[PDB]
Each structure stands twice: as structure tokens, then as C-alpha cells.
Amino acid sequence: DPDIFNRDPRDHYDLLQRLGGGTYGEVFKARDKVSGDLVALKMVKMEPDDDVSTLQKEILILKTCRHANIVAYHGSYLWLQKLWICMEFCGAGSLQDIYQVTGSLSELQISYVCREVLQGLAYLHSQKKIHRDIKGANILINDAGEVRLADFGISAQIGAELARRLTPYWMAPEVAAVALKGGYNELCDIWSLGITAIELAELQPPLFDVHPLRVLFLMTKSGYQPPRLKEKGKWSAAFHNFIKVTLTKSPKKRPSATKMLSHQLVSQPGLNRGLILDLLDKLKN
Amino acid sequence: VVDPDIFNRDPRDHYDLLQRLGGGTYGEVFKARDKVSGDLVALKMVKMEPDDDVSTLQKEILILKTCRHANIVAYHGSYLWLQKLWICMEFCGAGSLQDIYQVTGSLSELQISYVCREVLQGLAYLHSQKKIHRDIKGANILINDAGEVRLADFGISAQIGAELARRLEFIGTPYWMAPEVAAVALKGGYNELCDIWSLGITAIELAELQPPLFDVHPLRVLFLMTKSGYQPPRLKEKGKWSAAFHNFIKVTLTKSPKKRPSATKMLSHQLVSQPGLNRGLILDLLDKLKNGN
Numbered sequence: 001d002p003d004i005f006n007r008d009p010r011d012h013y014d015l016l017q018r019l020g021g022g023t024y025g026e027v028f029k030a031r032d033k034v035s036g037d038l039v040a041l042k043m044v045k046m047e048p049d050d051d052v053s054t055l056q057k058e059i060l061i062l063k064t065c066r067h068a069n070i071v072a073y074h075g076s077y078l079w080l081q082k083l084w085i086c087m088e089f090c091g092a093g094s095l096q097d098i099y100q101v102t103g104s105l106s107e108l109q110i111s112y113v114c115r116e117v118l119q120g121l122a123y124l125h126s127q128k129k130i131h132r133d134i135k136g137a138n139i140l141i142n143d144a145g146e147v148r149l150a151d152f153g154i155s156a157q158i159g160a161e162l163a164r165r166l167t168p169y170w171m172a173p174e175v176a177a178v179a180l181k182g183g184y185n186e187l188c189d190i191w192s193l194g195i196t197a198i199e200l201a202e203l204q205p206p207l208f209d210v211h212p213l214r215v216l217f218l219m220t221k222s223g224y225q226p227p228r229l230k231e232k233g234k235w236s237a238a239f240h241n242f243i244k245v246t247l248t249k250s251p252k253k254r255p256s257a258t259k260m261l262s263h264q265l266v267s268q269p270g271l272n273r274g275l276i277l278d279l280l281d282k283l284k285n
Numbered sequence: 286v287v288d289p290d291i292f293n294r295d296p297r298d299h300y301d302l303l304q305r306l307g308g309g310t311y312g313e314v315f316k317a318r319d320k321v322s323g324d325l326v327a328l329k330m331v332k333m334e335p336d337d338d339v340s341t342l343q344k345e346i347l348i349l350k351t352c353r354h355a356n357i358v359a360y361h362g363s364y365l366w367l368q369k370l371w372i373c374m375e376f377c378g379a380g381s382l383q384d385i386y387q388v389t390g391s392l393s394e395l396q397i398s399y400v401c402r403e404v405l406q407g408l409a410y411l412h413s414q415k416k417i418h419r420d421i422k423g424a425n426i427l428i429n430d431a432g433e434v435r436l437a438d439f440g441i442s443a444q445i446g447a448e449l450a451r452r453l454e455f456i457g458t459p460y461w462m463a464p465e466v467a468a469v470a471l472k473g474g475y476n477e478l479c480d481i482w483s484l485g486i487t488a489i490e491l492a493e494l495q496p497p498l499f500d501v502h503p504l505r506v507l508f509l510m511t512k513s514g515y516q517p518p519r520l521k522e523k524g525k526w527s528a529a530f531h532n533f534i535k536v537t538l539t540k541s542p543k544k545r546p547s548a549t550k551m552l553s554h555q556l557v558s559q560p561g562l563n564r565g566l567i568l569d570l571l572d573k574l575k576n577g578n
């Protein structure tokens with residue numbers, strides 16, 4: 001990235017605790033030495049001859065977002081052959097971290113989450129960005145009960161892959177759409193949010209118990225039926241309709257994020273971060 | 286310590302010194318050639334006794350070493366040997382834009398537009414690195430033989446940084462200090478938008494071969510700028526320049542720093558995003574320079 005700091009991140013942050021890590025790198029809870037504010041620092045391998053294009057695109061996405069519902073970005077550091085991406089500290093982790101302990105969320109809790117995610121998606125889509133990986137694991141929660149979309153890794157990989165693949169004159173229109181856009185548009189995020197709502201209500205997405213390759217074939221068949229909430233009586237008509245409309249099969253009829261923000265499930269009164277503070281209290285006690 | 290990455294060795298073991306390019310209070314600058322590759326460098330040689338304060342040179346090297354961008358002069362390391370500090374930097378064979386226009390005369394509007402775009406790219410980078418150049422002018426914009434525009438001479442930036450750090454060390458107890466006094470102590474009295482103003486003056490310099498008020502006593506200029514009613518300068522020969530150039534001058538020379546556009550914002554201005562802004566404009570300038578020499 002053109003604006004990476006060629007400086008030691010430890011000169012700027014005290015690494016308080018390692019929060020997690022794997023093949024994707026490591027994530028640390030850290031404190032700004034000057035301000036005392038908490039941040040999350042993601043440390044990834046970045047060696048002299050490594051391919052940087054995907055991490056490049058991820059930083060580009062983060063640096064150009066300025067919206068409360070997208071994780072804040074505080075710059076990146078290249079030091080000791082590691083790239084340190086400094087981002088917002090969301091002290092409750094992801095909704096997936098939470099629901100593995102609490103169990104399914106209430107309808108009001110899901111409605112608030114969906115509203116907040118839709119606010120972030122409307123912003124991303126207004127910038128011609130697509131998240132492409134909406135799911136409970138990528139929706140982070142801070143100690144105030146606020147909701148932030150995170151982890152643009154898949155979006156960055158696709159943005160880099162599409163550019164690498166980037167003569168068209170013999171291509172069928174459906175091939176040209178893959179070469180230029182990847183074969184779909186920003187409305188894929190709306191579908192993914194509908195699946196995520198089911199995930200929050202039922203602790204797993206539809207077909208989670210089916211082999212993933214069979215799932216791919218099933219969804220690509222003509223006649224695939226969009227999924228539904230299993231226990232119809234547990235949920236209001238508004239929630240069922242939210243699922244029906246977000247899981248519209250044809251992208252030409254699936255509503256945009258801005259339009260979905262007017263849906264009765266997410267525009268109803270009484271949706272606020274207190275609903276998630278309740279969830280965090282259940283997680284704690 | 287001046288520099289954790291300092292080379293404690295004689296730079297003349299690696300480089301053959303060619304001509305002295307310049308010299309003065311700041312030290313001496315030499316053209317030099319790598320004994321292996323034959324590549325050219327510029328070496329700045331400064332006196333460095335064990336008793337001397339290293340803070341300013343430490344901060345200049347820090348800027349050169351950490352700020353890596355296609356519009357910032359390249360850095361090749363530093364040497365300490367026999368109480369002389371040698372800062373090894375990019376050889377920019379055409380010298381500065383001032384060296385150039387003293388031979389070629391005024392630049393074309395397209396050439397100025399290209400220079401402004403390249404400088405703005407370097408400034409946007411520097412400002413994102415939390416640095417302020419503070420000495421943008423034709424003499425500090427170098428052109429290498431590839432026609433690339435490189436911001437150079439961070440001596441003033443380093444001096445200001447060193448003075449701020451020293452004054453903070455002696456600020457004393459803060460509990461009775463007003464917030465604006467604390468802000469001046471931590472951040473100085475102005476911000477990075479000062480560089481945008483300086484670029485506007487530089488654009489006039491490239492068009493007219495002098496900055497505005499060049500013939501006015503420097504103390505009188507300082508007084509006039511602090512007067513209420515001060516009018517930012519303008520290009521003098523209005524008909525020679527396009528409305529876009531006049532507007533570029535108008536907005537970069539916005540008097541109030543709260544209303545002056547950032548480097549990133551200025552990069553969207555018509556003058557620096559118009560078609561035909563390419564490196565060939567600078568190579569044509571260098572062709573004219575070579576004909577003049």
C-alpha cells in the first residue's frame with residue numbers, strides 16, 4: 001500500500017494481549033501509547049518477494065471507508081517482515097463467538113443487527129464496494145453493543161483476482177460479465193445478510209449439514225428454493241418477509257441495501273444497542 | 286545516536302567522489318559513482334563531532350529513510366567516518382527546477398501542471414506519513430535524468446521537528462496552561478496545509494521565474510502577510526494562462542488554512558487531472574535544458 005508506515009508498530013502500541021491467530025496471521029489487543037485508546041492489530045506475513053496484491057486491496061478498502069458500521073482503520077506498518085493492520089477494537093468479538101455461548105438471538109436482537117449491517121452495506125455499495133463474505137463471524141460487536149462489519153479478505157482476494165484476469169471481442173455476454181465484474185453484483189450481500197439472519201436465529205445457515213460441493217450444485221440448479229426459517233411460529237410475519245425478500249433468487253428483483261433499510265423489520269422503533277448489551281449480559285452471566 | 290542504521294565505515298571505500306555539486310553552512314554535496322555498478326549518487330557531507338547535537342540530522346535521515354514514494358528523493362544510507370556524516374541520496378542529474386528554469390526560462394502551463402500533480406502526490410504521501418515538508422519551492426523539487434519529479438531537502442522539516450521536541454522537553458508543568466498553548470507545544474502553530482500554499486507560490490515561480498514579492502524586503506513581506514486584509518498573490522500575465530491555472534492558484538493560495546484544500550483534494554483539480562499530463566513533458570524540458578547547455 002502506498003501509505004504504509006515503515007516503522008515499528010511497537011513504538012506506537014503496547015501489545016496488551018494476543019486475541020487469536022492462525023494461518024491468516026495473528027490478532028492482538030493493543031493500546032495506543034499516546035492516546036490510551038484500544039485497537040486491534042492484525043499481524044500478517046509480508047516478506048520481500050511475497051505477492052502483496054491481495055493485502056494491498058484489503059488495505060485500500062479499509063482506508064477509504066469512513067462509516068460507523070465499518071471497522072475503523074488506523075493505518076498499517078511494515079516491520080520485521082510483517083504487515084501490521086491497525087483496526088477498531090470490538091471487545092466482544094464476532095456474533096459467532098457470542099452465539100456459540102448464548103444460543104440463538106431474539107428477533108429484536110437480529111433486527112437491530114440487520115439494520116446496522118444494512119447501514120454498513122448501503123455505505124459500501126455507494127462506493128461500489130462489495131463485502132462478499134457477510135456472515136456471523138464477520139460481524140463484530142464492541143462492549144457498547146455497537147455493530148461493525150469486518151474482514152474484507154475475500155473481497156480483497158476477488159478484487160485482486162479480477163484485476164489479474166484483467167481480449168473480450170469473442171466473449172458471450174455472460175462470459176464478459178465474469179471477466180469484468182466476476183459474474184454478480186452488490187446484491188449478493190443482501191442475500192448473505194438474509195442467510196446470516198437465519199444463522200443468528202438457528203445457530204447455523206441452511207444446508208449446513210449438507211456436503212458443500214452438493215450445496216453448490218443444488219443452489220445452481222434451476223428450481224432451487226430459497227431457504228426459510230424452520231420454526232415459523234417463533235418469528236413474526238415481518239421477520240419471515242425480511243427473509244423472503246432478502247433471499248430473492250433473481251438479482252434483478254432483490255432489493256438494494258438502502259431499500260431494505262425501509263423494511264418493517266429493521267425500521268421498527270426500539271432497535272438500539274441495548275438489545276446487544278442484553279446479549280452480552282447473557283454471555284457473561 | 287544519529288541513525289541506528291549508520292554505516293561505520295569510509296564511504297570512499299564504496300564510492301568514487303566526482304565533482305562537488307555545492308556546499309555551504311549545511312555541508313558539502315558531491316556527485317559520486319558506485320565502484321561496482323557505476324551508478325551515480327549524491328553524497329551530503331556534514332561535520333559531526335562527538336559533542337554536536339544530532340537531533341536535526343537524526344530527524345532528516347529518519348524522514349529520508351522511512352518516506353519511500355515515487356515523488357520523494359531516494360535514500361541509500363548514511364556513513365559516519367572521522368567525524369563526518371555522509372548522507373547518501375539519489376543523484377538527480379538535472380538538479381532542481383530552479384537550476385532548470387534559470388537556463389530554459391519559464392515552463393509551459395502543461396509542464397507546470399505535471400509538476401504540480403507530481404508534487405501533490407508526494408505531499409499527499411508525506412502528509413499521510415504525518416510529516417510536513419515546510420520548504421516547498423523550485424529549488425527543492427529535483428528532476429532526475431528519467432524525468433521523475435522528486436521532493437527533496439527535508440532540512441527545514443527536520444529542524445522544526447528538532448526544535449519542537451526540544452521545546453517540549455522544557456515545557457514545564459502544564460496544569461495552568463491554556464489548551465491552545467498545549468496544542469502549540471505538541472503540534473506547532475500550523476499544519477500540513479502550509480505545503481499547499483507553498484506549492485501555489487512554486488507554480489507562480491515556475492511560470493514567472495520569481496515568487497511574488499521577490500523584490501520586497503523579507504521582513505516587510507512577513508509583516509504584510511500577518512496584516513488583516515492581506516491579499517494572496519496571483520499570476521501577473523492573466524492572458525497567458527488558462528482559467529484552470531488561475532483557479533488552481535486561487536484555491537492553493539486560500540488565506541485561511543481551515544478552508545485551504547488538502548493535497549488529496551487538490552489532486553482532483555482540473556489543472557492536474559486534465560489529459561496530456563505525462564512524463565514526456567519533463568523529458569522535453571530536459572531536452573531544452575540540454576540544448577541550452
Ligand SMILES: CC1(C)OC(=O)c2ccc(Nc3ncc(-c4nc(C5CCOCC5)no4)c(N[C@H](CO)c4ccccc4)n3)cc21
Pocket residue numbers: 019020021026027039040042071087088089090091092093094097140150151152
Ligand atoms: C481480523 C478481523 C476479523 O478482520 C478485520 O477486518 C478486523 C477488524 C477489527 C477487528 N477487531 C477485534 N477486536 C477485538 C476482538 C476481540 N475478540 C475477543 C474474544 C472473542 C471470543 O474469543 C476470543 C477473543 N475479544 O476482543 C476481535 N475478535 C475477532 C473475532 O473473534 C478475532 C480475534 C482474533 C482473531 C480473529 C478474529 N476483533 C478484527 C478484525
Ligand SMILES: CC1(C)OC(=O)c2ccc(Nc3ncc(-c4nc(C5CCOCC5)no4)c(N[C@H](CO)c4ccccc4)n3)cc21
Pocket residue numbers: 306307308314327329358374375376377378379380381384425427437438439
Ligand atoms: C541537497 C539536496 C537538495 O537535499 C536533498 O535531500 C537531496 C537529495 C538528492 C540530491 N541529489 C542531487 N543530485 C544531483 C544534483 C545535480 N545538480 C547538478 C547541477 C545543476 C546545475 O548547477 C550545478 C549542478 N547536477 O546534478 C543535485 N543538485 C541540487 C540542486 O542543485 C543540489 C546540489 C548541491 C547542493 C544543493 C543542492 N542534487 C540533492 C539533495
Ligand code: NA
Pocket residue numbers: 424425438
Ligand atoms: Na535545498
